[PDB]
């Protein structure tokens, strides 16, 4: 039972219909997806858990689809953000799309038969779409009354000076239509993402039902939190990037070594492919050894090799 | 003084900046406009006051633009409407545009040189506009906080069974953008409409300042009411259409004959080109004649010939 195996790692925040999805996974291979927006020229550790979950699903014989947000990255996801995102130029967004497309590739298998990974660009869903087609064919299905109650944007709708553009208010419709398109064109039945994406995923489930009368599912992975409540995934006052030109393999490895004892066994479950039994045995050995814990060393080795391969790991340890 | 003379006839509900507009009108001819949506294959009495005001401005030496809503008729204006409207198909709206254009034409002079009327179709503003272009270049200028506080829609935002689609919520941006386009393409500085259009007009004034840094203006004409408080422009629970195949010249004429004494002298001011002093002298006549009022007769004769021509007036009396 794949959902139960992910639950043992703490990797399931919410599922739209856990029993129906478990029955669907049990029937054999499905196609699933996760989206990644070009907000920078690199993904960071906030993208890593869902990216590794695509690989976990592919290991269980499902077909992962990585969607790069050519269209959505021109709009900006307001979900649980206090302030409007910078509107980037088309030329800048296109350059970041290509960089992010190359970055996701190593995490998935593009050559393993029927469940080979697919990469898609949601620009394909909107590049030929007239404004009037969007507002009518998609917009008619969205209740503004329901949109203003989505937890993801509620904080933006108190004060006008802390408010939201029509631009970012529309984002929910774009990711909603993206699910309907991936279902109709690619046979995708599951979207995963961080818990912040719950409301964008359920809009897609509801819109796919409205447009196509196909039944699809949502599953969210936790936002990564530390026992001490400080922000996860910052190094010397900036993001931990997956790009070694942005965060050196050395700085990446040192980030993992510096993990708190309270966080390290959870982080092994989130960020590595070590079995639950290996992680549980490491916890016990660290508890009943008397020496300083080695969990941090293992985590730094495992994740550094995953993101930067043996070459990056030797560069970090040189 | 034009605004002053319109006020004498009861034809001015609100002006956005009366002093700055009266100054512009005194300098020389301006271009102004009023929009009509293809909600049906005909205009009705709810359209007649805005249309006659377009005519009054032209007679005063200004250049009227009659905009038919080729794009906006595909979306639907929610302003002060209790309920979401039905969508029409593109092929139907196309047909209805051509019918409304033909209905509006006779009211304006397309053959008087400088101040010749223009027929415009807002489809041209959106026909080649991609959804992402709209959301970015127009949508970034709109605060959802300000939009949900517009009087025209705020009462659709209490309960979802009385709610509003993203489609109709978007209408205000399309009309806003229409003003900006007409400003840049034709030098239009004034939009007139029914009092229901105030918020649609002010979004176009604001958007025009943001896009073009030009000051433009709005003037609303009253929604016509009966002194008895009942709905104006309904005969037998239906609309009074300007199309003689929908509302016969006879029924149209009888609608005016059956005008309340408390409405007739006010309606002579709204709907005819008689002097105030002539209408006042007619009021005097009906006051102290002993006989039946002549005013409802004069109103029926004048408005039937204005709307249906001599042929219509002859058909009304048979
Ligand atoms: N909103 C996500 C990014 C994202 C991008 C594209 C997606 O694909 S679509 O086909 O559903 O649009 C989905 C999610 C974030 O901000 O992380
Ligand atoms: N909303 C108006 C109709 C309308 C139609 C077109 C207009 O032109 S535009 O260029 O501003 O779009 C303006 C107003 C009604 O419901 O009567
Ligand atoms: Na299962
Ligand atoms: Na944005
Ligand atoms: Na509508
Ligand atoms: Na308003």
Q: State the catalytic residue, choosing from B231, B261, B314, B317.
A: B231
* Annotation says B226 is catalytic: no
Which residues does B107 contact at the CB level (< 8 Å), separation at least 6?
A: B51, B52, B54, B55
Q: Could you tell me if B124 lies within 8 Å of chain A, comparing CB atoms?
A: no
CB atoms within 10 A of CB A141: 19
| Nearest-CA residue for atom 14 of ligand 1 | A35
Name the residue with tokens 């009309």: B175
Residue B207 · residue B176 · CB < 8 Å: yes
Q: Do residue B166 and residue A140 have CB atoms under 8 angstroms apart?
A: yes
Residue B38 · residue B97 · CB < 8 Å: yes
Q: Could you tell me if B181 lies within 8 Å of chain A, comparing CB atoms?
A: no
What's chain A's Rg over C-alpha atoms? Answer: 20
**How, if at all, do strands A234-235 and A238-239 pair?**
antiparallel
> Does B175 contact ligand 2 (Cβ within 6 A)?
yes
Resolution value, angstrom units: 1.8
Supply B133's token pair: 């272009």
A83 alpha carbon to ligand 4 midpoint, in Å?
Answer: 9
Question: Which of B78, B11, B76, B84 is CA-nearest to residue B38?
Answer: B76
Q: Could you tell me if A187 lies within 8 Å of chain B, comparing CB atoms?
A: no
A46 vs B287: CA distance, rounded Å = 82
Supply B1's token pair: 């003084």
DSSP assignments along chain B, one per residue: -HHHHHHHTT--SEESSHHHHHHHHHHS--EEEEEE--SSSS-BHHHHHHHHHHHHHHHTT-EEEEEE-TTGGGT---TT-SS-PPP--HHHHHHHHHHHHHHHGGGS-S-SGGG--EEEETHHHHTT-BHHHIIIIIGGG-BHHHHTT-HHHHTTSS-GGG--BHHHHTHHHHHHHHHHHHHHHH-EEEEEEEGGGHHHHHHHHHHHHHHH----EEEEEPPPB-TT-SBTTEETTEE-BSSTTTS-HHHHHHHHHT--HHHHHHHHHHH----HHHHHHHHHHHHSSSS--SHHHHHHHHHHHHHHHHHHHHHHT-
> Does B199 contact ligand 2 (Cβ within 6 A)?
no
Going from the C-alpha of B27 to that of each of A190, B18, B22, B61, B112, the distances in angstroms are 65, 14, 9, 12, 20
Best probe of the B interface among A72, A82, A145, by most B CBs < 10 A, is A145
Q: Do residue B131 and residue A130 have CB atoms under 8 angstroms apart?
A: yes
Best probe of the A interface among B94, B125, B131, by most A CBs < 10 A, is B131
* Annotation says A47 is catalytic: yes
Stated length of chain B? 318
Fill in the DSSP letter of residue A190.
E
B152 vs A98: CA distance, rounded Å = 44
For this PDB entry, the determination method is X-ray
Supply A173's token pair: 């419709």
Give the Cα-Cα-Cα angle B149, B150, B155 (nearest 5 degrees). Answer: 75
| φ, ψ for residue A163, nearest 5 deg | -100, -165
Domain ranges of chain A: 2-221, 234-317
Q: State the catalytic residue, choosing from A234, A261, A287, A314.
A: A234
B265 alpha carbon to ligand 2 midpoint, in Å?
Answer: 30
Residue B246 · residue B308 · CB < 8 Å: no
Question: Which of A194, A209, A201 is CA-nearest to residue A172?
Answer: A201
The breaks in chain B (C to N more than 2.5 Å) occur after none
A66 vs A121: CA distance, rounded Å = 9
Residue A100 · residue A36 · CB < 8 Å: yes
Q: Do residue B130 and residue A126 have CB atoms under 8 angstroms apart?
A: yes
B133 vs B142: CA distance, rounded Å = 14
A127: left (phi over 0), alpha (psi -120 to 50) or beta: alpha
Question: Which of A171, A164, A33, A155 is CA-nearest to residue A104?
Answer: A33
Q: Which helix (H) or strand (E) holds A6?
A: helix A2-8
Going from the C-alpha of B207 to that of each of A259, B28, B176, B187, B213, the distances in angstroms are 51, 25, 6, 15, 9
Q: Which residue of A has its CA nearest to B166?
A: A139
B57-81 burial, b at 16+ Cβ within 10 Å, e below that, comes to bbeeebbbbbbbbbbbbbbbbbbbb
CB atoms within 10 A of CB B55: 17
> Does B243 contact ligand 2 (Cβ within 6 A)?
no
Residue B164 · residue B157 · CB < 8 Å: yes
Give the Cα-Cα-Cα angle B130, A76, A57 (nearest 5 degrees). Answer: 105
Which residues does A148 contact at the CB level (< 8 Å), separation at least 6?
A: A154, A157, B144, B148, B157
Residue B34 · residue B54 · CB < 8 Å: yes
The alpha carbon of residue B231 is apart from the nearest alpha carbon of chain A, in Å, by: 29
Residue A196 · residue A152 · CB < 8 Å: yes
Q: State the catalytic residue, choosing from B14, B92, B235, B302.
A: B235
Q: Do residue A157 and residue B144 have CB atoms under 8 angstroms apart?
A: yes
> What's the distance, CA B60 to chain centroid?
18
B234-316 has CATH 1.10.240.10 classification: yes
Residue A282 · residue A298 · CB < 8 Å: yes
CATH T-level topology, domain B2-221? Rossmann fold (3.40.50)
> What's the distance, CA A232 to chain centroid?
15
| Nearest-CA residue for atom 4 of ligand 1 | A35
A134 alpha carbon to ligand 6 midpoint, in Å?
Answer: 26
Supply B140's token pair: 């970034």
Which homologous superfamily does the CATH classification assign to the domain defined by A234-317? Tyrosyl-Transfer RNA Synthetase (1.10.240.10)
Question: Which of A177, A184, A188, A175 is CA-nearest to residue A65?
Answer: A188
* Annotation says A196 is catalytic: yes
DSSP bridge pairs for A32: A64, A190
Residue B269 · residue B279 · CB < 8 Å: yes
Task: Please give, one letter per residue, the 3-state secondary structure of A51-65.
Answer: HHHHHHHHHCCCEEE
Going from the C-alpha of A31 to that of each of A52, A58, A67, B10, B19, the distances in angstroms are 15, 9, 13, 66, 64
B19 vs B72: CA distance, rounded Å = 31
Best probe of the A interface among B132, B142, B158, by most A CBs < 10 A, is B132
Which residues does B153 contact at the CB level (< 8 Å), separation at least 6?
A: B78, B79, B147, B164, B168, B169, B172, B199
B114 vs B62: CA distance, rounded Å = 9
Residue A210 · residue A242 · CB < 8 Å: no
* Annotation says A9 is catalytic: no
| φ, ψ for residue B139, nearest 5 deg | -60, -30
Fill in the DSSP letter of residue A137.
I
């Amino acid at each position: 039972n794949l959902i139960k195996q992910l639950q043992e790692r703490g990797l399931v925040a919410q599922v739209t219909d856990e029993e129906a999805l478990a029955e669907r996974l049990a029937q054999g291979p499905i196609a699933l997806y996760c989206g990644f927006d070009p907000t920078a020229d690199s993904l960071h550790l906030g993208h890593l858990v869902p990216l590794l979950c695509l690989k976990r699903f592919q290991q269980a014989g499902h077909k992962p689809v990585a969607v790069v947000g050519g269209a959505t990255g021109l709009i900006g996801d307001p979900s649980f953000k206090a302030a409007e995102r910078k509107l980037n130029t088309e030329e800048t967004v296109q350059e970041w799309v290509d960089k992010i497309r190359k970055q996701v590739a190593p995490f998935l298998d593009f050559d393993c038969g029927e469940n080979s990974a697919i990469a898609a660009n949601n620009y394909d869903f909107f590049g030929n779409m007239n404004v009037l087609t969007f507002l009518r064919d998609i917009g008619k299905h969205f209740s503004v009354n329901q949109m203003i109650n989505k937890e993801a944007v509620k904080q933006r709708l108190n004060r006008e000076d802390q408010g939201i553009s029509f631009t970012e208010f529309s984002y929910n419709l774009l990711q909603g239509y993206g699910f309907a398109c991936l279902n109709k064109q690619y046979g995708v039945v599951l979207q995963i993402g961080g818990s912040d994406q719950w409301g964008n995923i359920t809009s897609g489930i509801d819109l796919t039902r409205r447009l196509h009368q196909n039944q699809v599912f949502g599953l969210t992975v936790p936002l990564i939190t530390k026992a001490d409540g400080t922000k996860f995934g910052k190094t010397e006052g900036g993001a931990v990037w997956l790009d070694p030109k942005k965060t050196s393999p050395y700085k990446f490895y040192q980030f993992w070594i510096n993990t708190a004892d309270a966080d390290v066994y959870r982080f092994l479950k989130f960020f590595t492919f070590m079995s639950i039994e290996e992680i549980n045995a490491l916890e016990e050995e660290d508890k009943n050894s008397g020496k300083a814990p080695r969990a941090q060393y293992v985590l730094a080795e495992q994740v550094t090799r995953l993101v930067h391969g043996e070459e990056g790991l030797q560069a970090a340890k040189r």
